[PDB]
Design a protein around this ligand. Structure first.
Ligand SMILES: [Mg+2]
Ligand SMILES: [Mg+2]
Ligand SMILES: [Mg+2]
Ligand SMILES: [Mg+2]
Ligand SMILES: [Mg+2]
Ligand SMILES: [Mg+2]
Ligand code: NA
Length: 97
RNA sequence: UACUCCGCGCCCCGGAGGACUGAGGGGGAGACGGGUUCCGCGGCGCCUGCAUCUGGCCGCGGGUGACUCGGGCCUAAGCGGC
């Protein structure tokens, strides 16, 4: 039926309080949990594009913000895609389909 | 110093990303010692102080070619015989 979400996650907020030597894997787990909360599902599959974006600065200094693209797919699962944006000014959740 | 995503599973394999050993090497080869640990196929009963679909583990088959490389010859420090 084509239900697609658009959302941004603050990655620097999700690694507050954790050692910097494990920033990127912690960010991956935070992305998965937040997506499960947003899509009301339990099976989240991340595209390697978001993985590349998350690791683009090494293991310590993750990018500050990321804009995601969630498309829902009695066996429902969410597929997440990275969307590249020029700026995050005045960007909020959009619900399409 | 260290893993992550997807196929597929933190540990096997593949692709993509991120790192490390840093030419007195966690590289490439020999002497001594070990003695089949080497290779292919199959497997997880034991072991692989977590797991295992992995393995120097278990089963079945294979594998080392010299006129020119080394030993066999010479003699050293020595040893033996007379
Ligand atoms: Mg270095
Ligand atoms: Mg050799
Ligand atoms: Mg072998
Ligand atoms: Mg054996
Ligand atoms: Mg010769
Ligand atoms: Mg000869
Ligand atoms: Na690689």
């Amino acid at each position: 039926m084509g239900i697609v979400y658009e959302h941004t996650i603050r990655l620097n907020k999700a690694v507050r309080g954790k050692p910097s030597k494990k920033a990127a894997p912690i960010a991956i787990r935070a992305i998965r949990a937040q997506v499960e909360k947003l899509a009301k599902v339990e099976d989240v599959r991340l595209d390697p594009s978001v993985n590349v974006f998350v690791w683009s600065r090494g293991i310590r200094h993750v990018p500050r913000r990321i804009r995601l693209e969630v498309r829902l797919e009695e066996h429902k699962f969410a597929y997440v895609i990275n969307k590249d944006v020029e700026n995050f000014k005045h960007l909020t959740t959009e619900k399409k389909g």
